[PDB]
Amino acid sequence: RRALRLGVNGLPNSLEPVNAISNVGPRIVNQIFDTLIARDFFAKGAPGNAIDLVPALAESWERIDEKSVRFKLRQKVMFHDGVELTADDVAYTFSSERLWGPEAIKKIPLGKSYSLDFDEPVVEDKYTVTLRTKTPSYLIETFVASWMSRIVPKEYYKKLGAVDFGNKPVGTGPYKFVEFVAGDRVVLEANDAYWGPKPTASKITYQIVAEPATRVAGLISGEYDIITTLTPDDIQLINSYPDLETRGTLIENFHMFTFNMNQEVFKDKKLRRALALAVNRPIMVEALWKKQASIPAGFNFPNYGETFDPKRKAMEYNVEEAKRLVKESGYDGTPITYHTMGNYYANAMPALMMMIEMWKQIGVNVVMKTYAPGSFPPDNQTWMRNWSNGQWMTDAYATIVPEFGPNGQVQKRWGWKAPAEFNELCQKVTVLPNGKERFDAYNRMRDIFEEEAPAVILYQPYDVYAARKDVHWKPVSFEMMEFRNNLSFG
Ligand SMILES: O=P(O)(O)O[C@@H]1[C@@H](O)[C@H](O)[C@@H](CO)O[C@@H]1O
């Protein structure tokens, strides 16, 4: 078997699966671990975007009532160290201790905020576990198929602790941990004792190549088999090589910019809204994305299913109103920093430079401030920054509630003083089953989100990879790389 060499935009600071949640962690942690339920992106000849859910670590499951789901586990699955997976490991994964309780916040900072209102799991037998919520939740199934739900080994994880575990992970996945050189590379090797499809690569390397031009040259020189996070501008040249090709797809994520609302200039919604109203998304999508990116109608995406609003109007663009808001605001002309980690996000700097021009036309002076990985300054030294949100559930709950909700980081850390009505609606949508009331509540939340502008949605990126034609692998419609029944050579 051939070793797979990947040229990547960045790496997570931990391989602990919840802590690894980002654009860069899942492509690694998806290899090391498994979930109870998994998504088959290639079902019924779909081009890596199928919504179909299939058994994975759980052979079957059944919803018992409004707050519990019973899982029948696959038997004789082994973790990479030979330990057998049991309901004990699954209960530990979803426990107060490890994940959502007061004692978990120090280890998994976003565990509680991103989790459901969990009750302790119930182990019925070695291969049967019930996952429950304290209050009604119809989101258990989608949560369990998500990146929040990779199953960790209880004894090994408790032995090392979440920090050391993140540096030496043990999972049930098709690839096992070899090395992690902080801010440089991750090496994984084939897990030949895997319960599912046998791994097709002997090894996988994720080498950070921060600069996309250098990443592109690395594939050209034969240093890499697949490279990530390219832009539509790289397409024509890469495809000019008979041996190389680009592979891309729209993904279930949106790029955005957001604010440090603890800062005086951003405490009020006025300048936040003025900056949002001056963002000409069609020109950015045309110029930087070659029309391949998509512009959603608010915090509203098709993967939400029953809570997607297909009749929703496009987000407003109004330069004259934006000019009036700047004039009425307390803004003096003082430069406002916008923190970006080079091109961690595809088109980060070209998108920012276009917006700086749009903002200059409305009377706002925005200045780019570059930071290297691990050098994001203290919160109070930041004003604007770019970010992204992966839409990780088959429901509108994510990411508006975990990120922007009353218990979330945009309010708690970043100082968004959300209107009381917004927080009231977040609590309602959490417990309600699908219906008119829940549907309408999400629309009112979308309306408040656009009015308040705690963040400004740019677009869904067209995720561009490039690969050698002799490396058969298809991208999926999510911020990760799938190799199960999707990697072969020659
Ligand atoms: O944009 P990033 O690469 O920094 O990572 C974000 C997370 O921070 C976020 O938790 C998640 C869900 O909304 O979406 C992304 O994965």
Numbering used by the authors: 32 to 521
Question: Would you copy out the relevant sentences from the publication that reported this structure?
Answer:
To our knowledge, the best known system that exemplifies this paradigm is the antibiotic agrocin 84, which penetrates into the cytoplasm of the bacterial pathogen Agrobacterium tumefaciens strain C58 by hijacking the PBP called AccA and its cognate transporter. AccA also plays a key-role in the importation of the characteristic plant tumour-derived compounds such as the opines agrocinopines A and B discovered in 1981 in crown gall tumour tissue. The mature AccA structure is a monomer of 493 residues composed of two lobes, each formed by a central β-sheet flanked by α-helices. We identified the pyranose-2-phosphate-like moiety shared by these two ligands as the key recognition template for AccA.
